């Protein structure tokens, strides 16, 4: 081989050793995998920026020294102790938010919309016959690429066929699928 | 059956914690290791480059590999000074070092890898010389290493070259601690119900295997952890599956009967930790999901109790800067931080749902069992926690929680 | 899949693609995992440009 190829071979083997760990793979799933219905809830301009800038519109930069982060934090309050009760409350809130979203892609109306996420660019409902990325669980565990075949709007799941032979056709909820082709955003005014 | 819903709820909880992190943390780094670590310990030495806003700390790491080569790892984690210049809006999902906070030069880089037979159960350095490091093997014996006598890059010959190899057990274990006062005194705890004591300060340089100085057979169930006192050089406690906390004294000619014996919990007891400022206080965590504080001047009354862990407890560590702070972790994916001084305070009526008035902070940063963690002894209130999901997090909670201006 | 000089090294693992020529032996595993989630595209033009026109 070559010193570069051998080295890059070592990087590849490192990654292989890392991915042979089921828990590490699950973490890789949690860290970066976002369904199209989850991305607008988090990855947009988050509530921290909005509340910070509304409390100090006179603050210039969103990045500065930790010592002034002490002030910008104290002058917002004491963050609530994040606990099991906090997590169940926030999970219920996420259920409400994503219930709102699915209500939005039946081309209907939704909540009063005081949330700082998803102003208008709600992710679109999936089309039939496109390539999407989803997590398949069970006897073949992991994340896989596949093709979409159907929609289940009533329960908000999808029917997919995978490009990996031997896996076939399975149903996967809306919040565990990612669309590879470029993300599509359309205003809520189109959603209703 | 429920593996789908449990994975789903873990995913949602982690995403929510990632979303509302900036309020809760002054600094987090999420770093993915090559193999899971059942251990972590900040090395006492700190170096500060001149004119640079970041210090260069150092951590001792082990690997949990299935069958092939394991390692003892000594990684260097760069932490920012108080004049740091960074961002706190989100993590990053963008820069190639970590989950965002702290200096741009926050980058765990491995420095020393060393051959180690089997997985590294626990690796504790010896206080009188951070060069020497003990390790716990899944086999019977307990190894001792010096990383000065080893190449930074391991030789692929695969020879385990411990400075000493310590024997005296019959099975494996997890308890292992040095005496911080007397050089070379090492305690180990194993499944064989015995607390074996070694001393390495008085071993030949020609002898590469050393017998145990003494063996303590007080426990009857599996011993889980053992720790020396932090002011008394001759006093150490141990916990076991037998729900019994026992306090031992070295001066005792009776090594088969402890000086004290306490039925601390109603379940398995996995950890204990002496208070480094009050030589009279110690705490334990246990399988009954409660953390039992104790006072050494009276072992019949449990000083106080902590709840709100939903699962087992596998670790407890007192703070090195404040005598009133300690943290615990277990099979539950959360690491809780307690405050003694807040005991008995009357909180608002609802907040009892979050936890008792003294529960100071809960860490929602790990998707799997948190194996072990340790406070940084140099930079206050910075903790490195490792977990079974190949993740090494170093984080510092937001400043305003611990300060009532 | 397409074994690699050092112009490009791609390994197909779990039906995903990652470009290993960008990473030296010193790189941590976190960027590698992120890239392997990315399903490494053709070009690595720029890393989410640090320049920000965001005003006060």
Numbering used by the authors:
A (entry chain C): 95 to 286
B (entry chain A): 8 to 412
C (entry chain B): 84 to 87, 91 to 142
Text taken from the publication that reported this structure:
Cell cycle-dependent transcription of cell cycle genes is controlled by the MuvB family of transcriptional regulators. The MuvB core complex consists of a main scaffolding subunit called LIN9, the histone-binding protein RbBP4, the DNA-binding protein LIN54, and the smaller subunits LIN37 and LIN526. Complexes of MuvB with the transcription factors B-MYB and FOXM1 activate mitotic genes during cell proliferation.
The excellent quality of the cryo-EM map allowed the ab initio building of an atomic model of a ~70 kDa structure accounting for the WD40 domain-containing RbBP4, the Domain in Rb-related Pathway (DIRP), and tudor domain of LIN9, the middle domain (MD) and a proline-rich loop (PRL) of LIN37. Strikingly, the rest of the MuvB complex is not visible in our map indicating that these regions of the complex are highly mobile in respect of the RbBP4 subcomplex. In our structure, LIN9 amino-terminal region, including the DIRP and the tudor domain interact extensively with RbBP4 in four different sites around the conserved RbBP4 amino-terminal helix α1, which is a hub of protein-protein interaction in several other RbBP4-containing complexes. The basic loop following helix 5 occupies the histone H4 binding site of RbBP4, by being sandwiched between RbBP4 α1 and the PP loop coming from blade 6. Consistently, a reconstituted MuvB complex is not able to bind H4 peptides.
